[PDB]
Amino acid sequence: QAVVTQEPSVTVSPGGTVILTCGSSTGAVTSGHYANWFQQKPGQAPRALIFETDKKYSWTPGRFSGSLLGAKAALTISDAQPEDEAEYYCSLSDVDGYLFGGGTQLTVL
Amino acid sequence: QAVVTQEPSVTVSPGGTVILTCGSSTGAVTSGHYANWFQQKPGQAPRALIFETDKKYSWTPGRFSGSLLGAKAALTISDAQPEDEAEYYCSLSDVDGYLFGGGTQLTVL
Ligand SMILES: CN(C)c1ccc(C(c2ccc(O)cc2)c2ccc(N(C)C)cc2)cc1
C-alpha cells in the first residue's frame, strides 16, 4: 500500500557531488524493489539511467551511480555538469506492480 | 519515425509454449536495447517481468524467459497457465529514450 517518495527539489554546485534519494512511504527500500532511475529534461522523452538498484546502461554517464543508502534507493551524481540539470524519476517495484515517485528537480548552480 | 512492433494477438493452449516477439523498425534488436517486458492482467496493475533482455525478478514465474531471437527480442512462455492470459508489453531503449510496443494479447484457452 506504499507510495514512492522523492524530495521535489535539490541543488548542486558545478563539479559537486549530489545524492538523490527515493523512499517508500511504508518501509525500507531494498534491492528486492529493483529501483530504476530515469532522467527527463522538460518537453523531452525520458531516458533510463539505472536499473536493478545499481546497474548502468551503456549510455549511463560514468558520473552516475545507483545504490542503497539507509532505508532508501540513491542516485549519486558525481562531478555535476550543467547538462545534469533535469528531473530525476525513481520507480520501485514488487510482486503487485511498479510505482513512480513524483520526481526530483535537480538544479546545477 | 521509429516504432517497436509486437504481434497484436497470440493463442496458446494450457501446458503449451508460445513465443512473443518484439521488433524494432530501424534495425535488429540487440542486448544493447535492454528489452523489458511487462504484464497486464485484466483488472490488474501492470507488473514488470523481464529486464535487460533476459533477467527475471524474484516474482517472475520461471516459465517466463526473455531472449534475443533472430532480429528481435522475445518472451517465451512455456507450460502456459490460464493466469498467463494477459496483455504483454515490451520496451526497447537507446541513448535517446525508450519505446513501448503496442502490446500482445495472449489468449490461453
Ligand atoms: C522494476 N521496476 C521498478 C521498473 C522496471 C522497468 C520500468 C520501465 C518503465 C518505463 C516507463 C513506463 O511508463 C513504465 C515502466 C522501464 C522501461 C524500459 C526500460 N528499458 C531499458 C527498455 C527500462 C525501464 C519501470 C520500473
Nearest CA to ligand 1 atom 16: B36
Q: How many CB atoms lie within 10 A of CB B58?
A: 9
Contact B45 A93 (CB under 8 A): no
Structural domain that includes position B8: 1-109
Nearest residue to B77 (alpha-carbon basis) of B60, B64, B58: B64
What is the CATH number for A38?
2.60.40.10
Please give the Cα distance from A78 to A10 (Å, whole number). 14
Match 552516475 to its residue by C-alpha cell.
A64
Query: Quick check: CB of B93 below 6 Å from ligand 1?
Result: yes
Task: Provide the domain count of chain B.
Answer: 1
- DSSP string of B45-99, one letter each residue: --EEEEETTTEE-TTS-TTEEEEEETTEEEEEE-S--GGG-EEEEEEEEETTEEE
Residues A31, A86: Cα–Cα separation, whole Å = 25
Q: CB within 8 A of B73, min separation 6: which ones? A: B21, B22, B23, B29, B33, B35, B53, B66, B67, B90, B92
DSSP letters spanning A39-84: EE-TTS--EEEEETTTEEPTTS-TTEEEEEETTEEEEEE-S--GGG
- Yes or no, beta carbons of B44 and A95 under 8 Å apart: no
Residues of B within 8 A of A46 (CB-CB) are 97-98
Whether ligand 1 lies within 6 angstroms of the CB of A36 is answered as yes
Nearest protein Cα to ligand 1, atom 7: A36
Please, are residues B53 and B67 in contact by the beta-carbon 8 Å criterion? yes
Dihedral sign from CA coordinates of A58, A59, A60, A63: positive
- Which three-class secondary structure state does DSSP give residue A90? strand
Taking CB atoms and an 8 Å limit, are B51 and A47 in contact across chains?
A: no
Chain A CB contacts of B96 below 8 Å: 45, 47
Q: Which three cell numbers stand for residue A35?
A: 529501483
Q: What does the alpha-carbon distance between residue A86 and residue A107 come to, in Å, rounded to a whole number?
A: 7
Residue A80 to residue A107: CA distance in whole angstroms:
10
Write down the residue that cell numbers 513512480 correspond to.
A100
Are the Cβ atoms of A45 and B97 closer than 8 angstroms? yes
CA–chain centroid gap for A53, Å, is 10
Q: In this structure, are residues B50 and B66 in contact, taking their beta carbons and an 8 Å threshold? A: yes
Query: Nearest residue on chain B to A36, judged by CA atoms?
Result: B51
